Paper text:
Lipoproteins in gram-negative bacteria are sorted to the outer membrane (OM) via the localization of lipoproteins (Lol) export pathway. Among them, [name], an IM-embedded ATP-binding cassette (ABC) transporter initiates lipoprotein sorting by selectively extracting OM-destined lipoproteins from the outer leaflet of the IM and transfers them to LolA, a periplasmic chaperone. Here, we report cryo-EM structures of [name] in apo, lipoprotein-bound, and AMPPNP-bound states at a resolution of 3.5 to 4.2 Å. Our studies snapshot 3 functional states of [name] in a transport cycle, providing deep insights into the mechanisms that underlie [name]-mediated lipoprotein sorting in [name].
As the initial [name] sample contained predominantly apo-[name] particles, we reclassified these particles using a soft mask to exclude densities with bound RcsF. After several rounds of 3D classification and calculation, we finally determined the apo-[name] structure at a 4.2-Å resolution using 135,391 selected particles. The overall structure of apo-[name] resembles a dumbbell. Strikingly, the TM1s and TM2s of both [name] and [name] are bent outwards creating a V-shaped substrate-binding cavity open to the periplasm. Both PLDs are in elevated position about 20 Å above the plane of membrane, as a result of TM1s and TM2s extending into the periplasm. Moreover, the 2 PLDs interact closely with each other, manifesting a twist of approximately 20° perpendicular to the membrane plane. In our apo-[name] structure, the Cα-Cα distance between Ala106 in PLDLolC and Ser173 in PLDLolE is only 5.4 Å, whereas the distance is increased to 48.6 Å in apo-[name]*. Taken together, we conclude that our apo-[name] structure represents the correct apo conformational state of [name], which resembles closely the conformation of RcsF-[name]. First, apo-[name] embedded in the inner membrane adopts an outward-facing conformation. The open conformation of apo-[name] allows lipoprotein entry into the substrate cavity via the LoopLolC-TM2LolE interface (i.e., the Interface I) in an ATP-independent manner.
Author numbering:
A (entry chain C): 2 to 397
B (entry chain E): 4 to 412
C (entry chain F), D (entry chain D): 2 to 230
The structure:
Amino acid sequence: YQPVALFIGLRYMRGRAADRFGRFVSWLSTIGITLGVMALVTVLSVMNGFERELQNNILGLMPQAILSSEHGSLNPQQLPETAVKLDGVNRVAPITTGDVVLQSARSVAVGVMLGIDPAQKDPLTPYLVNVKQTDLEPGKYNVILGEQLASQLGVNRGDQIRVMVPSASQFTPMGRIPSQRLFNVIGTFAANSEVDGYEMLVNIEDASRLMRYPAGNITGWRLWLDEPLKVDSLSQQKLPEGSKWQDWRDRKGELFQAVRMEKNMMGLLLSLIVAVAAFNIITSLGLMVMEKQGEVAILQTQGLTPRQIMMVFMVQGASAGIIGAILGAALGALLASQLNNLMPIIGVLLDGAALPVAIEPLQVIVIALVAMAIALLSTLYPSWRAAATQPAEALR
Amino acid sequence: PLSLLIGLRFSRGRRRGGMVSLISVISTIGIALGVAVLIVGLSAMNGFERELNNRILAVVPHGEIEAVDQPWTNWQEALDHVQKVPGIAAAAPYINFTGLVESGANLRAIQVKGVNPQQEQRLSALPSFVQGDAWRNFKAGEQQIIIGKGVADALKVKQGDWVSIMIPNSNPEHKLMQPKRVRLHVAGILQLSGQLDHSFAMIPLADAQQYLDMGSSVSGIALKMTDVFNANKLVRDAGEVTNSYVYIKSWIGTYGYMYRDIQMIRAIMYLAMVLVIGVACFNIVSTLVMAVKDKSGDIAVLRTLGAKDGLIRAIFVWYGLLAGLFGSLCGVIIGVVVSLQLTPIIEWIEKLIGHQFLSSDIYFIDFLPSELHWLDVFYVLVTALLLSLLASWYPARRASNIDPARVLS
Amino acid sequence: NKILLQCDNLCKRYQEGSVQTDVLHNVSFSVGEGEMMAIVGSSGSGKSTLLHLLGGLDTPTSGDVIFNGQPMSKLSSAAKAELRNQKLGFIYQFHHLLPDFTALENVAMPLLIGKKKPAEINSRALEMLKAVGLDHRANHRPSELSGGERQRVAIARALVNNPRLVLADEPTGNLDARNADSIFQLLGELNRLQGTAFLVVTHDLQLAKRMSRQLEMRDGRLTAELSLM
Amino acid sequence: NKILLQCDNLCKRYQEGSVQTDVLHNVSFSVGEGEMMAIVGSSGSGKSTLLHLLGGLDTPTSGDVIFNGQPMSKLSSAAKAELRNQKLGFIYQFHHLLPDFTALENVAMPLLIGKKKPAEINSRALEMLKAVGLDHRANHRPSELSGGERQRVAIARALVNNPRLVLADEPTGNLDARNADSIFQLLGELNRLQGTAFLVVTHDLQLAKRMSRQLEMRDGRLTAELSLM
């Protein structure tokens, strides 16, 4: 026959059809763990969707990784792109990046300049308006500004702006002179994100000449990742000799770090629910033991080892945990990816887009196993207490 | 007193000590954890509200009106019409520059605000937040500027140091190119918040009009309401009073997300802790089921003395309410203990665990504040009592509907 | 002369199918106020079921307990509650005490359910306490006292409200004679003066002979009804 | 003669000093296989705890119960489990059934504990039902059952796997006589064929005298030792 503990364990949690109430009383623990895991999964899914939106709006439009040389600029001859292949990277493109100061007639701003070759598309080119991508040919100093940046400076097509770099200043008898050049607006870039505020595009050749680099050099290789959330792990990868690694956490790391922190803060703030549910489990057994002590001793008079009775109660506890966790995960998955449908018929707090929802099965699996382990630890103690009790004291 | 004292005796009727008192302390721990964490969260949000009230909305201009075409020829006329508009506490003019501050080979492009000191004292509490300086002696004709501390430390400049300021000063003539580079002397350091101090630099308004070579005019007018939550309509009306050339900007568009996020955080914690108390009241239900199964004989005896069909229900509802009451107090004690020593607790955790919580110019404040509101405590305790009563309600009704003779024979 | 309560043709079956036995048939009582009736019978001879039925604990399958022509069955269970609290006093032969209350609460509990204000109920309890004779140990735990004392405390708490009908199902089985004669005389003056009626069911024949006119309730049938005259 | 079971200086105390009663102290037994020892006495005269000590359920303070050379003290818990599973069968004072388990599985439970395939265990359960005589009531609910049947089902459970030693502490409290004769005939049948030894505790001397060998323990000490042959 199947191991003896399983039969008794499965049979106690069912039965007692004379009232149809004891079933609810015993399943209260499963209900509580189900609500806890449902709340966890739905809130983590919503926050993951919001974070996915942020990463496609902030990181989606900026160099997600940048590989440069140890000293000075990068020479494409030394490290060709076909020789620059790594794990997790799906695309490599030559790039130069810099921080510059932009001077219009009426106001001044700081910006991030991206020197690229016009023949290659960037994820912002679909948002480019009234601008041929190939038009950024070298020597004409064609520059595309963001919509918010252009609005703040208040210039448009056909207006000149002075771009200067103070970090690349050169000493002369008239002091330190920062590099400067006049640039001609050729259109506007409208991506409707924070990046639109400070990102501006120029040709790679003029950009290289601007930072006082020797001709033919580029700053480095921009690398795209399938999952940037693990850049730290990618930072541990072996790199080609003489290179250095840089990444987005230089500028926008803290914010994303903050987001992650906030997540796991809520990650505990709702997790407490299941912890409380765990407590209920113990009390449930605190019921059943005193409701079944006068019977378990008989099983003791049978061949039941104490190590078998510990199992027969722990398996009941684990069965409650398993059923609760699986049912809660199923209800959370059903509620996720569909809350956009149910929300409008009732009051919706947010204005505009209703709600982003991105569900990652890894999170669901992790929280499911966490629920399993917490249920097991909760059900451990009363089982051992019942096992250690000698039959005589239970009887008298 | 009340005839329900019997229940307390059942509360004092605890036998078979050991493994039966464990469930009691488990229930108490659950109630206490839920209630205490709820109170910590609510007090932390109230402290955040207080700090947003003091640190930020008392230094920013609550309303802005800017001329779209030209600096006002009649700025004084517009302002002295608008100061008698009802629902307005004060108004003042200001001029808005943006320029390059350079010192120690470090250059930063920042916006500059030129205001009249005696009026901005009324317009805001900003000079009160200066660490230490001549916040009142700041006047015109001295080539003095005040810089926020973040810009000062990122620029490697200190008090009593000289800086150069470059302004475009565009003119229709050829002088628009090669922006004018004046010299200036820093005088004080501001310490407002994590974000506000990295962009504010203030100059005297008369020296502002002098350094621009512009006329007796300002680039905008700032407004302070008495009530801020309805500033949009008030500023719309105020701009309606003067000419139609104005454009109104209300802080609410920029900063109402902070308020609404605080409200939604409060809602999230409230709902989640309601769920927590719900699970704990399931625990209470289990305890009462055990109590009924163990005192069936005594309740039968109570029945054979001619008690009514609700008296037993009253006994057990009071039993449940008392059981919840014990844990609720045992949690609110900690809840009140924290939220007054909370900041040292959090900095202790911060030193013990080498991880910064809110710093690095993302949250508006650095530390975790707190403020205790007793009405919130009362509301929370009432919520706990109501949930416990709702839980205890069903077992009482079940106990009422058992006939002693039905089971005895 | 019975007017208050009359029992007629009490029938009850309390088993499942197949083994379903109509244990009782044509059970009728003639209990008149002011008269002392005793029920005699042997142990396990089908006497406890109807005796518990006489308290209105379960609904008879057939037969009536009629009050002045007003039937209990048609009126609500709350009516049964005040009948059990104020007009009728019923005693189980088990102790059935409350370990959590002292003697004072254990004896005044029916008065407490009588929702009267503290002074007169407390005085009434003290009066019953002096009549019983256990004033020495008033406020300690009843659990740590002897058997007969607990039984007589149960009897006292049953007789505090001076109910019309006092059904006492062997009050002296676990009691010695030194307290038995005292409680017998006590109930004697209560019966002669206040006039409450007693239906005392007892097993031992000698103590059964101590009552004036005697029924014999055997095997669910009233066979012998012995009267002095 | 006696090989299976040997008791050595049985002593047991389960409380603290001074108040410690020597219910067992230097008590030795001669338990023979194939014979019927019966112990008689009153309630609370050490009839229960003594015989529960025989099952290895508790640890005696002094002395040990040795079965074929294994003292309980050095004997592991699993070995005691197998011993009480395949050699000893015990009946409590009550029925001690499992209200979650129906009669068939309730009586087959040790057989599944015996870890053998369902066919023979179900066949054994059916033949036990034949011997008990309740072919009609095989799968109905113990809750919808009377007392004597459930206690005799408990006895059957205790005897399914053919104990060498069948220990019974007053097995017929709720069981009447016209069933008692039949069940004791069944026990005699198992005695003449299987030869298992029954240790029956009882209060009435009539049934106890018809046992072959009888010890009498009054106030915790064995007074009478009479064996027919």
